Amino acid sequence: SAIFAERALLPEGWARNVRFEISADGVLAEIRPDANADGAERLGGAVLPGMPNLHSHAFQRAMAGLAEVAGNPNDSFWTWRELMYRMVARLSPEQIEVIACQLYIEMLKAGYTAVAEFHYVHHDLDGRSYADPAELSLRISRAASAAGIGLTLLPVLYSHAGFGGQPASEGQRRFINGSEAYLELLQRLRAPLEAAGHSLGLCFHSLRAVTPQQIATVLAAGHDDLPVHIHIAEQQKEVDDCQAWSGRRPLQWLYENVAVDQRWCLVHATHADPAEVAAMARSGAVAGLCLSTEANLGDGIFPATDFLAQGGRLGIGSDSHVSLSVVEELRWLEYGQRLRDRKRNRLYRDDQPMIGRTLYDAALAGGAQALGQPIGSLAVGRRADLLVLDGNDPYLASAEGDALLNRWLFAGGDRQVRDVMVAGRWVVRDGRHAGEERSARAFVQVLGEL
Numbered sequence: 001s002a003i004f005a006e007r008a009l010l011p012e013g014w015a016r017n018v019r020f021e022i023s024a025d026g027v028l029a030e031i032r033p034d035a036n037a038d039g040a041e042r043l044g045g046a047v048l049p050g051m052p053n054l055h056s057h058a059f060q061r062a063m064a065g066l067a068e069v070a071g072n073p074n075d076s077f078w079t080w081r082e083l084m085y086r087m088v089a090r091l092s093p094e095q096i097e098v099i100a101c102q103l104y105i106e107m108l109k110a111g112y113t114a115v116a117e118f119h120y121v122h123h124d125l126d127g128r129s130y131a132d133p134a135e136l137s138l139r140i141s142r143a144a145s146a147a148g149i150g151l152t153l154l155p156v157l158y159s160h161a162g163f164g165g166q167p168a169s170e171g172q173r174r175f176i177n178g179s180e181a182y183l184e185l186l187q188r189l190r191a192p193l194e195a196a197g198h199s200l201g202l203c204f205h206s207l208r209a210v211t212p213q214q215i216a217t218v219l220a221a222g223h224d225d226l227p228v229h230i231h232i233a234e235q236q237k238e239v240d241d242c243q244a245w246s247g248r249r250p251l252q253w254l255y256e257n258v259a260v261d262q263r264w265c266l267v268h269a270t271h272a273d274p275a276e277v278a279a280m281a282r283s284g285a286v287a288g289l290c291l292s293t294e295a296n297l298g299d300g301i302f303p304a305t306d307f308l309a310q311g312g313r314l315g316i317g318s319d320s321h322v323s324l325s326v327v328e329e330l331r332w333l334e335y336g337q338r339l340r341d342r343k344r345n346r347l348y349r350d351d352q353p354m355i356g357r358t359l360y361d362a363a364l365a366g367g368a369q370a371l372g373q374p375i376g377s378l379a380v381g382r383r384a385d386l387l388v389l390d391g392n393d394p395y396l397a398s399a400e401g402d403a404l405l406n407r408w409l410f411a412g413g414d415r416q417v418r419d420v421m422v423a424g425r426w427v428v429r430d431g432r433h434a435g436e437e438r439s440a441r442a443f444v445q446v447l448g449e450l
């Protein structure tokens with residue numbers, strides 16, 4: 001099939017009159033700027049690579065916004081976590097799948113074309129494994145296929161309630177596997193995921209939830225083709241607790257004990273000191289920044305300017321899914337730096353003064369890297385994942401090139417995303433997803449049950 005864009009953001013920058021040929025398998029086959037649109041579908045606005053969403057816990061969308069109730073003069077991440085545990089305790093396999101499908105449809109409508117699902121809900125309500133332990137992982141994959149979103153499934157190793165290998169709490173029972181069972185699950189997922197065109201990654205929940213021996217064991221197991229994700233340094237309390245346990249800060253500890261490299265996505269990484277920031281940038285690991293969730297949970301502000309300055313790589317994730325908006329994450333990534341520094345125009349490159357373009361470029365690259373997928377760029381051989389902005393919008397129609405990204409990301413919003421393609425298939429057209437009516441009906445029923 002062929003599509004034609006009057007304006008498109010290609011790897012070398014903005015281009016005009018671009019004709020794309022897309023293979024039967026949804027791969028970009030030919031990309032020709034300054035071309036004719038003969039026989040190709042003319043697109044309705046500016047075309048961008050789709051944005052990868054590098055961190056998600058799907059089920060949390062069901063509780064999104066409901067935890068905004070003061071139950072203490074000092075509510076925090078940790079009282080929130082108890083509420084999250086209460087919901088996860090009652091979620092059936094069918095409910096989990098319905099929530100995921102609905103969530104992925106909403107992600108697509110926002111311009112997220114692929115998602116890394118950081119998946120730790122493994123077992124039944126009693127904490128016992130399903131007859132096929134991959135039961136819930138397979139439902140995540142089925143939901144992603146139904147929505148049409150790209151997927152890297154990250155089954156999560158979760159074994160302990162805290163540093164020093166503390167025993168898992170009852171509230172964590174659905175998450176728990178030892179290293180051996182985890183590795184069996186991981187290996188068993190390869191075939192079904194491959195069959196769906198989906199990807200896989202290794203994942204440790206956090207340094208609180210696994211032991212150093214488990215990390216070594218898993219990393220030595222031979223899955224060298226896989227991304228590696230971990231929540232790290234999100235909350236000050238984890239930093240303090242890590243120091244009491246090891247005499248090291250979380251990021252410090254990880255870098256001293258593990259060969260962190262480009263395979264890694266360090267989710268949050270919020271409390272990184274100057275040395276830790278330097279080590280992250282040197283390693284080529286991706287910082288998985290979840291701005292709306294980090295603000296919602298009162299985590300803090302990442303040192304993004306220092307990090308970017310040293311060649312740091314980053315991407316964005318919607319995480320708890322209080323927000324499903326590429327615009328909001330990138331906008332408030334920048335705005336948080338502005339509020340901290342009390343200055344403007346914080347995240348730019350030496351070769352790129354445009355803030356919107358800097359942010360979009362960065363998150364596309366970090367997102368693709370963290371997912372381990374051939375995405376993030378409209379280049380021959382990469383997957384045809386793209387969004388089409390509103391060509392009739394007066395702000396966008398009046399802008400060219402990087403100014404258009406500034407109008408969208410800093411003055412515009414989600415409804416400016418009109419059409420979305422993943423793997424060469426249109427999954428959103430004029431703001432609508434074909435499965436939205438059925439999904440919303442299933443979803444409202446599930447919310448009522450919960």
Ligand SMILES: N=C(N)N[C@@H](CCC(=O)O)C(=O)O
Nearest residue numbers: 057081206231234293297320
């Ligand atoms: N940290 C965030 N935001 N989310 C975590 C909460 C549980 C924890 O970290 O122990 C999670 O969904 O696993």
Ligand SMILES: [Zn+2]
Nearest residue numbers: 057118231319
């Ligand atoms: Zn998370």
